[PDB]
Design a protein around this ligand. Structure first.
Ligand SMILES: *[C@@H]1O[C@H](CO)[C@@H](O[C@@H]2O[C@H](CO)[C@@H](O)[C@H](O)[C@H]2NC(C)=O)[C@H](O)[C@H]1NC(C)=O
Lengths: 258, 35
């Protein structure tokens, strides 16, 4: 995903990769040894020492976060629900549908739904509320299989119906298409878009800013239901957040130029 | 008492004893100055 987690191939400098990184395997019997680095990796490494527990990290196979197709849950949520893992670190938004089955810790960063446009006055604006005027035909984001997709589909039928003709390849192709002009607006998570404008060719920006945040929530750590690990990790992470190093990690990994 | 509904922030010491629910409005600490 976004710089919370980054996958890098080992370098021939040492027949591997240096410290400040942890080996990670791409599951699928044979495996190639990669090593993963990022924000969540750093927070996990910092957490491990205090509570003194062992860990092994492995990637997801099916991918695409989480979904519920007739109870067939894929992704990290699918992996943790069927008792195939103990925790699922990384990008994950706490909402009503997910929390029914799997327990969560406290949030550590702020996030939500934002809007990205090329260089509108909120969700309830008539442009997104009344798609019937043909002279300003706008465009949207809506990376499918997304957490926000469920919300926008559940809350506004007309927008979901009119969002069919939307660019959908990645958080990379949308930026290129917007820089081209093949679309008009983009909607996705907040903590990733506000960073994505941090270091970009020129200065592409968003609307008013953090004042325009919809369904404000945070990222969290999932865990199997009814385990002492849940309480232990939650209290430890609260103590760490109260310490204040989270700001240092943020300024190390979440700073931009524009 | 049995329940607290007030602007009560969360910290380690209080988290040691009582159990909290999910938060509903984020904030911080800021300085008040007179113009
Ligand atoms: C969500 O993830 C699923 C699982 O990988 C993808 O499944 C596709 O679903 C569409 C119909 O929605 C089928 O036409 C494809 O054949 C399925 N497989 C693939 C590989 O695309 C799906 O693409 C993702 N997105 C949506 C909107 O379902």
């Amino acid at each position: 995903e976004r710089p919370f987690v980054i996958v890098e191939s080992p370098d021939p400098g040492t027949g591997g990769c240096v410290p400040n990184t942890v080996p990670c395997r791409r599951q699928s019997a044979p495996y190639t040894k990669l090593c993963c680095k990022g924000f969540c990796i750093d927070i996990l490494k910092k957490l491990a020492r205090v509570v003194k527990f062992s860990y092994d990290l492995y990637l997801v196979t099916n991918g695409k976060h989480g979904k519920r197709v007739r109870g067939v849950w894929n992704g990290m949520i699918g992996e943790v629900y069927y008792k195939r893992a103990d925790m699922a670190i990384g990008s994950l938004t706490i909402n009503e549908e997910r929390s029914e089955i799997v327990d969560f810790s406290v949030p550590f960063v702020e996030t939500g739904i934002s809007v990205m446009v090329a260089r509108v006055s909120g969700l309830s604006d008539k442009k997104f509320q009344r798609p019937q005027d043909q002279y300003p035909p706008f465009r949207f984001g809506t990376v499918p299989n997304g957490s926000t997709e469920r919300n926008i589909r559940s809350n506004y039928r007309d927008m979901h119906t009119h969002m069919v003709k939307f660019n959908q390849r990645s958080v990379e192709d949308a930026l290129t298409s917007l820089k081209m002009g093949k679309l008009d607006a983009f909607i996705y998570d907040a903590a990733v878009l506000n960073y994505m404008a941090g270091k970009d060719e020129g200065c592409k920006l968003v609307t008013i800013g953090s004042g325009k945040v919809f369904a404000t929530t945070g990222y969290g750590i999932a865990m199997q239901k009814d385990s002492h690990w849940k309480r232990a990790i939650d209290l430890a992470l609260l103590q760490f957040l109260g310490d204040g190093e989270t700001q240092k990690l943020e300024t190390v990994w979440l700073s931009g130029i524009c | 008492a049995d329940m607290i509904v007030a602007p009560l922030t969360i910290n380690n010491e209080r988290a040691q004893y009582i159990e909290f629910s999910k938060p509903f409005k984020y904030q911080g600490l800021t300085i008040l100055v007179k113009k």
